[PDB]
Amino acid sequence: ELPAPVKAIEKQGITIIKTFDAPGGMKGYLGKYQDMGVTIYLTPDGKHAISGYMYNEKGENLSNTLIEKEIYAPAGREMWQRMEQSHWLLDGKKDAPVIVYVFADPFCPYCKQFWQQARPWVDSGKVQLRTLLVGVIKPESPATAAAILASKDPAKTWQQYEASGGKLKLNVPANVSTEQMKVLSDNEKLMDDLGANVTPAIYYMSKENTLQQAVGLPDQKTLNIIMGN
Amino acid sequence: ELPAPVKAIEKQGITIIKTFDAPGGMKGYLGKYQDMGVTIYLTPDGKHAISGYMYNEKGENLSNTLIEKEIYAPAGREMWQRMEQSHWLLDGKKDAPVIVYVFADPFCPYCKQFWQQARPWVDSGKVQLRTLLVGVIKPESPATAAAILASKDPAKTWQQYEASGGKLKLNVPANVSTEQMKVLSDNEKLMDDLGANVTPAIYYMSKENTLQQAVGLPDQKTLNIIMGN
């Protein structure tokens, strides 16, 4: 079966995912304890195993890197793709290295405050905010979001709208177009799939491309991390 | 200096105590993170180190054993000796394998309840309770404790006293003898040195002879552990 020392560690509540190659003639085992990723290393003598974190000369926590890359990160990747394939509005330079998605409703105070918080990074060209509009808070949310999407330059209109705290006057059409309704409904479903029904629901990448989430108004630390600082 | 991989781990908040021999050509380092003991193992390639716990074929957590034996346990040993050298009263067989010390006052409800809880183990000859009397709760505590020490068979009198819930009538002398006062004062100082002023203050051995403490009335789990079950 499995080496005795490793079997002993399994009995401590660990479920093995797979085996992997490690340095120094050691064999590695990737697993989980409850929801936590863990790495086990079989010693050269083969009669001992160490459950813990391996570091290299440069000081990188190799176990952390592997756990984030193979356990925590994967499942959310297809979601990041779905957001990229959605009809989002661009706020910032198209080539900004840091991409942040935000599900926002026209009648949401914190969406506006987050928009303001992000200015330094967006204006410097470091971050680009991609907004996926939804109409779920107020009776007029759908129509207002659709009106923004119906404007000549939706992205600019949204920026002006958020900058004005929602005081920006708009031309609200006689009805929501079928295309606008599809965008809003598709965005709402994706938002629901991501797990947070409250706006703003902010998504960004960190920790070996793990899809991260922030809901509501981020505090200073979370903001700096979202912005890739 | 120290191997680079180990130096990297030190930077994560670890302070090294000493180096030690490990299996498979690996070098071990014993240290602490805050108040927690930790073990680090340098890999055969010498360019990596693992911070974690080593297990053997029999399933023993060797790191835990070493940490308990060399870090957590030592400092309290001299205290266990001081209790053994004190004037305690025996409750149970002199050859009972499990020794439990208890600092008790004559006017303490929980001391009496703990005494009752311990009967099964004391009567089976598995545990021996060694009581170090103190007189600190009530005005009459000193005189009553001294009266017990002054009786023909102090140990039996104490047992009868606890069994009766303190209703056992006693012959209280005209004064506390100098020897009785020395016992009470010495016991009180040792109790204070151990860190718990509340009675009952219970001491026992577990985890590689680490001096353990229980204060007040132990719940079922703690009781079973104190009794060595």
From Swiss-Prot, chains A, B:
It comes from Escherichia coli (strain K12). SUPFAM superfamilies: DsbC/DsbG N-terminal domain-like, Thioredoxin-like. InterPro entries: DiS-bond_Isoase_DsbC/G, DiS-bond_isomerase_DsbC/G_N, DiS-bond_isomerase_DsbC/G_N_sf, Thiol:disulfide_interchange, Thioredoxin-like_fold, Thioredoxin-like_sf. Homodimer. Interacts with ErfK, YbiS and YnhG. Changing C111A: Partial loss of redox activity. Traps the protein in complex with ErfK, YbiS and YnhG. The gene is dsbG. Keywords: Chaperone, Disulfide bond, Periplasm, Redox-active center, Signal. It holds the Pfam family Thioredoxin_2. The keyword Chaperone applies. This is Thiol:disulfide interchange protein DsbG. GO terms for molecular function: protein disulfide isomerase activity; protein homodimerization activity. It is found in: Periplasm. Its main location: periplasm. One of its GO terms (biological process) is chaperone-mediated protein folding.
